Amino acid sequence: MISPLAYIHPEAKIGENVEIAPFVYIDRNVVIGDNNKIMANANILYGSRIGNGNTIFPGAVIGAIPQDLKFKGEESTAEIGDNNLIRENVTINRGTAAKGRTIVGNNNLLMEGVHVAHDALIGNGCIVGNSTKMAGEIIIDDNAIISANVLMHQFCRVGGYVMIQGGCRFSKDIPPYIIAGREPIAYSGINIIGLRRRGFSNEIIENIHNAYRIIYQSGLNTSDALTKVEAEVPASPEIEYIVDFIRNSERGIIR
Amino acid sequence: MISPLAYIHPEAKIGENVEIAPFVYIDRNVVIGDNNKIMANANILYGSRIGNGNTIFPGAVIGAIPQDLKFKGEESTAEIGDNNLIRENVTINRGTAAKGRTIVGNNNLLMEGVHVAHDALIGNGCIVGNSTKMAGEIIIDDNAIISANVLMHQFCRVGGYVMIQGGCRFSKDIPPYIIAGREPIAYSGINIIGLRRRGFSNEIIENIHNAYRIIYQSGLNTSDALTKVEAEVPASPEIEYIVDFIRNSERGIIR
Amino acid sequence: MISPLAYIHPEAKIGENVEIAPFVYIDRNVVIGDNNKIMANANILYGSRIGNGNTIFPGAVIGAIPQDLKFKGEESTAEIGDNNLIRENVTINRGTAAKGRTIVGNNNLLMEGVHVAHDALIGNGCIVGNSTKMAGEIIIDDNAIISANVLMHQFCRVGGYVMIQGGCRFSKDIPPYIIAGREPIAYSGINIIGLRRRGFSNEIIENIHNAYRIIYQSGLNTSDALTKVEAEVPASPEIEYIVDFIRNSERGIIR
Ligand SMILES: CC(=O)N[C@H]1[C@@H](OP(=O)(O)OP(=O)(O)OC[C@H]2O[C@@H](n3ccc(=O)[nH]c3=O)[C@H](O)[C@@H]2O)O[C@H](CO)[C@@H](O)[C@@H]1O
Ligand SMILES: CC(=O)N[C@H]1[C@@H](OP(=O)(O)OP(=O)(O)OC[C@H]2O[C@@H](n3ccc(=O)[nH]c3=O)[C@H](O)[C@@H]2O)O[C@H](CO)[C@@H](O)[C@@H]1O
Ligand SMILES: CC(=O)N[C@H]1[C@@H](OP(=O)(O)OP(=O)(O)OC[C@H]2O[C@@H](n3ccc(=O)[nH]c3=O)[C@H](O)[C@@H]2O)O[C@H](CO)[C@@H](O)[C@@H]1O
Ligand SMILES: [Ca+2]
Ligand SMILES: [Ca+2]
Ligand SMILES: [Ca+2]
Ligand SMILES: [Ca+2]
């Protein structure tokens, strides 16, 4: 199960039922859980923390030092949870002193060439398309869908259930449940396909849609819009999430 | 010729005069033809079918399972023909039950980082630029030129002799002989440079140009335009290909 | 320091205090200087020339033959200087007969997936973001900052101290000290953040800003603008560099 043509530092901690292919390189100060599959020519570097049930494809590089020139050799980690699919040549750099941990959650698919920068946070259940670049200290909430070649600026946040269209770029927050597309990026309606696939009721979908008609299409500033959403849209956890996300948005939200 | 520092599963079928570098990983259920060169740290995975006379550069990954979450472990292949240049970190995933075979033809150049998704079809004589992403079940006809960082949506088709400009994205079909550029993508004239390089007559080039003036610049709907092309442009296989491609376009064509 | 699980051709010239990880592949006709660190699964190919004090991350490929189909097997090199950071899956192809040497200078950071084409020239002190593609025979002057997913057309030149925003593409020259952004790309003001960080005086910054107000915002053609800059902006090496760069621009400059 562990190929003798892998390089595995004696100090690496490796769980049970782990398959390691030839030409895998595993450093010291590495923790790997159970039921992982690490394919040929992958690199698991100093500071990596891997959970259970993941598949790491050829050429993936987990734990390299930050690309941030402010890095000065401080201790940090690069972490993934359980049941993720980490495709070919995906890079997940370890953290900087700004946070100290780059973290990916559970049940994500990071397609080939995806980059996860120092101190980034990915939740659970996300799909991130080919060669998308997530810059320093970003946050992706659960259940987001990001297409290929997306550029997410540092410090931004993406809400749950969004679909970001391929090739888009953005340097503001993207609030939950929306489609973000075009150049420059813009609110492009609700992710109705995603929400219907996930079994959201037509009524909840319509409420979400009405909240965003208020936010984006009623000529109201952000405070007034959120007031009106709170007054006029039948309340539910989904509507509270919209409101809370926007009200506390660190960057502001996209147009 | 075959490095002893390569890993080659005993069941892999390997032809004559094949050069395999150190740290190449070749799985079972692999067929490789004659006169291939496979460079260091390349991966040829379960289900790969490789023809003759190819060069596979370092870090290329052929045959990994689809990125489609609908994949359920069905048998499939990833295939390349003869005389291709498969550059660094090119990914060619094997197929899904939707078709079952990802196929690249002969005499293509897939530049570094190019992704070929499950069930895609590439013809012959194509050039595909750095990190271009071809999504599921796409079709590329012979002799196309696609620049770098292009995003081709699933189920789309690209006709012969096109030039798609760098960074463009599209989710409709691109008809033969044209330049497609800008954002949003658009018909940008004829690929006269390509056609002149390939020895097309000035007369045939002018006919093609006239067909597309009718299609794109005469205010006609698609049916009327194609009627008029068939009536007024001197007929040739090139003009029939334009007409047939557009008339049977599954997605519609770009604007 | 040199792993016995690396492949190193006996003819490769390797300097002192060089750390080489497992699964590194080093060819013949390679020169590597002192104090280098070459990480696992990197490839240093025929014709590579590496200076001192560099770090080459996993999956980087230095020296592969040009992607230019005009290449006919001529001798050429791929070269990097001193103190560079060459990140994961960076590709630096060797040259063609058009020049014969692909050259990267000193103290650069080439982030993951960056491509450096045949015969390209990179200076010193540059930062080039994730997966940026530099096409054939380009030139990057010292101290440039290029963000991620940038496409630089062949034969173009980028001046010092620019910031090119993420996802931009361009096929004209970019003159020194500016921000280039948007689609289509455009002059977007001065790189004041960069210049202030590097300790430029507020007075020199204001002069630069005034030169570009003349060039871009005064309705003057290029000759008249440069005449007026030479007459009205207090002279300094920075202003002479602006003027000289534009006056001798091979492609013309961006709008
Ligand atoms: C991660 C995954 O499994 N992706 C697969 C999935 O893509 P995906 O489900 O995106 O593709 P489909 O072609 O099924 O989707 C139809 C349309 O719905 C859109 N859409 C989809 C989901 C969503 O939450 N919001 C939304 O707006 C898509 O962008 C597309 O325009 O099916 C494709 C077609 O079989 C496959 O090639 C992809 O590999
Ligand atoms: C695959 C290949 O060999 N590419 C090489 C080729 O590019 P390519 O032939 O594209 O480059 P050139 O600079 O020769 O082309 C001149 C112009 O014609 C355009 N054009 C080209 C072909 C076409 O079918 N349609 C069209 O519109 C190009 O985009 C460019 O704007 O020459 C460049 C300059 O030596 C090299 O760096 C590239 O590596
Ligand atoms: C190579 C490097 O060390 N990059 C790091 C640096 O990026 P960088 O310095 O680019 O990031 P900052 O967030 O510090 O910059 C603030 C703003 O200034 C802009 N700007 C920056 C420099 C410049 O010359 N011109 C200019 O216009 C940036 O694009 C940004 O919009 O700090 C980020 C935030 O800690 C880190 O995640 C990056 O890894
Ligand atoms: Ca606040
Ligand atoms: Ca790689
Ligand atoms: Ca039909
Ligand atoms: Ca001249």
PDB file of N, CA and C in Angstrom, chain A residues 117-148:
ATOM      1  N   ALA A 117      -3.765  30.166  -1.318  1.00  0.00           N
ATOM      2  CA  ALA A 117      -2.714  30.956  -0.784  1.00  0.00           C
ATOM      3  C   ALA A 117      -2.668  30.840   0.723  1.00  0.00           C
ATOM      4  N   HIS A 118      -1.559  31.343   1.254  1.00  0.00           N
ATOM      5  CA  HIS A 118      -1.345  31.416   2.695  1.00  0.00           C
ATOM      6  C   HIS A 118      -2.523  31.998   3.464  1.00  0.00           C
ATOM      7  N   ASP A 119      -2.917  31.283   4.515  1.00  0.00           N
ATOM      8  CA  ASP A 119      -3.927  31.771   5.493  1.00  0.00           C
ATOM      9  C   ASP A 119      -5.349  31.779   4.928  1.00  0.00           C
ATOM     10  N   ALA A 120      -5.559  31.212   3.723  1.00  0.00           N
ATOM     11  CA  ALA A 120      -6.877  31.115   3.186  1.00  0.00           C
ATOM     12  C   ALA A 120      -7.690  30.101   3.979  1.00  0.00           C
ATOM     13  N   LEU A 121      -9.004  30.263   3.917  1.00  0.00           N
ATOM     14  CA  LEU A 121      -9.971  29.388   4.539  1.00  0.00           C
ATOM     15  C   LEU A 121     -11.000  28.956   3.504  1.00  0.00           C
ATOM     16  N   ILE A 122     -11.094  27.647   3.280  1.00  0.00           N
ATOM     17  CA  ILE A 122     -12.166  27.023   2.517  1.00  0.00           C
ATOM     18  C   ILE A 122     -12.992  26.165   3.452  1.00  0.00           C
ATOM     19  N   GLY A 123     -14.306  26.305   3.354  1.00  0.00           N
ATOM     20  CA  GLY A 123     -15.227  25.495   4.109  1.00  0.00           C
ATOM     21  C   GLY A 123     -15.410  24.085   3.606  1.00  0.00           C
ATOM     22  N   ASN A 124     -16.679  23.687   3.517  1.00  0.00           N
ATOM     23  CA  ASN A 124     -17.066  22.316   3.192  1.00  0.00           C
ATOM     24  C   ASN A 124     -17.940  22.283   1.985  1.00  0.00           C
ATOM     25  N   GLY A 125     -17.849  21.206   1.231  1.00  0.00           N
ATOM     26  CA  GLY A 125     -18.836  20.988   0.181  1.00  0.00           C
ATOM     27  C   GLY A 125     -18.636  21.913  -1.032  1.00  0.00           C
ATOM     28  N   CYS A 126     -17.476  22.507  -1.177  1.00  0.00           N
ATOM     29  CA  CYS A 126     -17.201  23.458  -2.284  1.00  0.00           C
ATOM     30  C   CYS A 126     -16.652  22.765  -3.496  1.00  0.00           C
ATOM     31  N   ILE A 127     -16.899  23.363  -4.638  1.00  0.00           N
ATOM     32  CA  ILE A 127     -16.283  22.970  -5.892  1.00  0.00           C
ATOM     33  C   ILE A 127     -15.567  24.168  -6.477  1.00  0.00           C
ATOM     34  N   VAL A 128     -14.307  24.024  -6.759  1.00  0.00           N
ATOM     35  CA  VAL A 128     -13.463  25.106  -7.265  1.00  0.00           C
ATOM     36  C   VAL A 128     -12.814  24.642  -8.552  1.00  0.00           C
ATOM     37  N   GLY A 129     -13.103  25.376  -9.621  1.00  0.00           N
ATOM     38  CA  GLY A 129     -12.744  24.984 -10.983  1.00  0.00           C
ATOM     39  C   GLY A 129     -11.286  25.183 -11.358  1.00  0.00           C
ATOM     40  N   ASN A 130     -10.894  24.581 -12.489  1.00  0.00           N
ATOM     41  CA  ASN A 130      -9.505  24.514 -12.969  1.00  0.00           C
ATOM     42  C   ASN A 130      -8.788  25.841 -12.873  1.00  0.00           C
ATOM     43  N   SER A 131      -7.654  25.803 -12.159  1.00  0.00           N
ATOM     44  CA  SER A 131      -6.709  26.888 -12.104  1.00  0.00           C
ATOM     45  C   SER A 131      -7.267  28.171 -11.469  1.00  0.00           C
ATOM     46  N   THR A 132      -8.297  28.063 -10.650  1.00  0.00           N
ATOM     47  CA  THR A 132      -8.750  29.222  -9.924  1.00  0.00           C
ATOM     48  C   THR A 132      -7.738  29.575  -8.861  1.00  0.00           C
ATOM     49  N   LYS A 133      -7.530  30.867  -8.662  1.00  0.00           N
ATOM     50  CA  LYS A 133      -6.514  31.392  -7.730  1.00  0.00           C
ATOM     51  C   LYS A 133      -7.181  32.121  -6.552  1.00  0.00           C
ATOM     52  N   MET A 134      -6.984  31.551  -5.367  1.00  0.00           N
ATOM     53  CA  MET A 134      -7.511  32.156  -4.132  1.00  0.00           C
ATOM     54  C   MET A 134      -6.369  32.799  -3.387  1.00  0.00           C
ATOM     55  N   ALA A 135      -6.378  34.125  -3.304  1.00  0.00           N
ATOM     56  CA  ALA A 135      -5.248  34.885  -2.754  1.00  0.00           C
ATOM     57  C   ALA A 135      -5.243  34.851  -1.209  1.00  0.00           C
ATOM     58  N   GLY A 136      -4.289  35.565  -0.630  1.00  0.00           N
ATOM     59  CA  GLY A 136      -4.072  35.498   0.811  1.00  0.00           C
ATOM     60  C   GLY A 136      -5.291  35.833   1.646  1.00  0.00           C
ATOM     61  N   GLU A 137      -5.519  35.026   2.684  1.00  0.00           N
ATOM     62  CA  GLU A 137      -6.490  35.332   3.747  1.00  0.00           C
ATOM     63  C   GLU A 137      -7.927  35.454   3.211  1.00  0.00           C
ATOM     64  N   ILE A 138      -8.235  34.734   2.135  1.00  0.00           N
ATOM     65  CA  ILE A 138      -9.597  34.700   1.659  1.00  0.00           C
ATOM     66  C   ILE A 138     -10.423  33.727   2.500  1.00  0.00           C
ATOM     67  N   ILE A 139     -11.735  33.829   2.355  1.00  0.00           N
ATOM     68  CA  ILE A 139     -12.674  32.958   2.975  1.00  0.00           C
ATOM     69  C   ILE A 139     -13.737  32.491   1.992  1.00  0.00           C
ATOM     70  N   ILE A 140     -13.944  31.175   1.918  1.00  0.00           N
ATOM     71  CA  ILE A 140     -15.002  30.605   1.104  1.00  0.00           C
ATOM     72  C   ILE A 140     -15.911  29.848   2.067  1.00  0.00           C
ATOM     73  N   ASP A 141     -17.164  30.274   2.094  1.00  0.00           N
ATOM     74  CA  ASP A 141     -18.190  29.592   2.897  1.00  0.00           C
ATOM     75  C   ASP A 141     -18.613  28.242   2.299  1.00  0.00           C
ATOM     76  N   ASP A 142     -19.349  27.467   3.057  1.00  0.00           N
ATOM     77  CA  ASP A 142     -19.760  26.154   2.559  1.00  0.00           C
ATOM     78  C   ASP A 142     -20.604  26.172   1.290  1.00  0.00           C
ATOM     79  N   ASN A 143     -20.443  25.140   0.512  1.00  0.00           N
ATOM     80  CA  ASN A 143     -21.288  24.864  -0.636  1.00  0.00           C
ATOM     81  C   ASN A 143     -21.183  25.832  -1.843  1.00  0.00           C
ATOM     82  N   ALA A 144     -20.074  26.521  -2.000  1.00  0.00           N
ATOM     83  CA  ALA A 144     -19.882  27.431  -3.093  1.00  0.00           C
ATOM     84  C   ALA A 144     -19.437  26.666  -4.310  1.00  0.00           C
ATOM     85  N   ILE A 145     -19.795  27.169  -5.486  1.00  0.00           N
ATOM     86  CA  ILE A 145     -19.296  26.687  -6.746  1.00  0.00           C
ATOM     87  C   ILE A 145     -18.595  27.807  -7.452  1.00  0.00           C
ATOM     88  N   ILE A 146     -17.309  27.610  -7.715  1.00  0.00           N
ATOM     89  CA  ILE A 146     -16.487  28.563  -8.400  1.00  0.00           C
ATOM     90  C   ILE A 146     -15.993  27.905  -9.661  1.00  0.00           C
ATOM     91  N   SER A 147     -16.172  28.553 -10.820  1.00  0.00           N
ATOM     92  CA  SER A 147     -15.724  27.950 -12.076  1.00  0.00           C
ATOM     93  C   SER A 147     -14.214  28.138 -12.278  1.00  0.00           C
ATOM     94  N   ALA A 148     -13.752  27.898 -13.499  1.00  0.00           N
ATOM     95  CA  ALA A 148     -12.355  27.899 -13.828  1.00  0.00           C
ATOM     96  C   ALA A 148     -11.825  29.255 -14.046  1.00  0.00           C
TER      97      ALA A 148
END
